[PDB]
Design a protein around this ligand. Sequence first.
Ligand SMILES: *[C@](=O)([C]([C]C1=[C][C]=[C][C]=[C]1)[N]C(=O)[C]([C][C]([C])[C])[N]C([C])=O)C(F)(F)F
Ligand SMILES: *[C@](=O)([C]([C]C1=[C][C]=[C][C]=[C]1)[N]C(=O)[C]([C][C]([C])[C])[N]C([C])=O)C(F)(F)F
Lengths: 10, 10, 131, 131, 95, 95
Amino acid sequence: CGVPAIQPVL
Amino acid sequence: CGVPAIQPVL
Amino acid sequence: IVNGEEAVPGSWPWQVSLQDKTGFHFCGGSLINENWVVTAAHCGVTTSDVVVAGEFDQGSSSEKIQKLKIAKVFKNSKYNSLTINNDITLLKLSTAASFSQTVSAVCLPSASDDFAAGTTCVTTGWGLTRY
Amino acid sequence: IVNGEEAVPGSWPWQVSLQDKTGFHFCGGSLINENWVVTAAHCGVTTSDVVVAGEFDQGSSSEKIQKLKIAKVFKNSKYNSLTINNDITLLKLSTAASFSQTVSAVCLPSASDDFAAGTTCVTTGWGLTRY
Amino acid sequence: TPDRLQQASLPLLSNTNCKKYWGTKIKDAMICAGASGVSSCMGDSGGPLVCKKNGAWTLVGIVSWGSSTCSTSTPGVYARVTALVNWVQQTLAAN
Amino acid sequence: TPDRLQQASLPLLSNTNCKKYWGTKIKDAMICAGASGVSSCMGDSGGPLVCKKNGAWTLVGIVSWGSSTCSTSTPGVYARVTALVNWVQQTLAAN
Ligand SMILES: *[C@](=O)([C]([C]C1=[C][C]=[C][C]=[C]1)[N]C(=O)[C]([C][C]([C])[C])[N]C([C])=O)C(F)(F)F
Ligand SMILES: *[C@](=O)([C]([C]C1=[C][C]=[C][C]=[C]1)[N]C(=O)[C]([C][C]([C])[C])[N]C([C])=O)C(F)(F)F
């Protein structure tokens, strides 16, 4: 869990 | 003091 | 969200949208696994609401979304509707979500975790963008 | 500043720029009144440095800036150069700043003030914008 | 509501500092964040407040309530997940 | 350095939470902020960290130091004005 396969970019 | 004559806009 | 920024599609993979038979987005939720949804208790979910996963744009006709039936609504009985204290409901799915590059679970903390003041965290949503 | 936004010109009226005979912007400072400048001690100001007020764009030839001489450098002797503890220097001007719509003083706290964690505050500068 | 999924970065505050804004309204199983120039709003309820810890995103709050008006100077009130997580473990366990 | 004056909004953190990043480097007359997705950098030193209190902007920190690299995940270290303000009052007074 917790590690999106597509990186959130902030 | 502390009150700019031109409002900072954030 | 007021003053947000558009997210990178599929990047908040656990982010579901609560909708009604009408197709109205009424609240959000988070996937904690394949059969289980977390949301607020005040959102007042019912079994005729649909958990919608893998959404980016409620306007698209072309996304590969999952419309999933709610079987049970687990309203925390420590929910104090007057107070809005302990505002959490679990939603058990009638059909398990299929996990993918865009549908995944968020991690849960253990009760003894610390999250200090001043920490930069992140919030997601389809909330009013302007009042 | 990394990930800043361009300020509205004249809106952080107390924000001065520290420059050298060369005209190089080396640190920032804040006006606390018309004769007195606050900055870090580590910035290592000298009397041949110039306090520059009312700047927005160091590139402009057309702003009504004040180039002001430093008379004295008051380095806090509690400054611990190894530690970088108590990093503050006062700079007394040889010529008083003229206060205007764009040159004004910042308020100082009393020692017994509280500024709680999680509070959104603001920082200004001409600092590296990318490393 | 916007068609597109929005996001926002923002700070957790203490309950203490939080009752500087909301007072006795702020209880133990609630966690505050924002007052930063961003705000959660009508339509966000149930949605997450995530913090990354040891490389992963942990559900730290559930969007609950705040400024009638989504003022971005007023901190949002969220459900505090640490206080409700045993209930969740207890529920998944039974059913 | 950019020609144009930049600004950034960001959160004060506690010393405690701050020594979670900087440890024994963090002393009493220093105040931490950032780790938000913004960072002060080389060229900002001496410049202000302002918080508004009762309608006015108060000098709460002086840009001191932080991540060698201006990492925006690393909190900036600032001078803590409350701890140095008597010195300032004492200096303006004598001269
Ligand atoms: C929730 O999306 C909103 C969310 C909201 C509004 C303002 C600030 C932060 C978040 N929640 C409400 O409107 C709630 C409802 C009860 C009190 C829990 N109350 C308020 C006023 O914040 C929504 F309910 F689906 F719109
Ligand atoms: C200051 O502008 C920089 C500012 C800075 C750098 C990184 C993060 C935050 C702020 N200060 C330094 O480079 C200082 C100097 C001593 C230690 C006080 N040290 C470091 C590494 O932060 C400058 F010095 F004029 F560039």
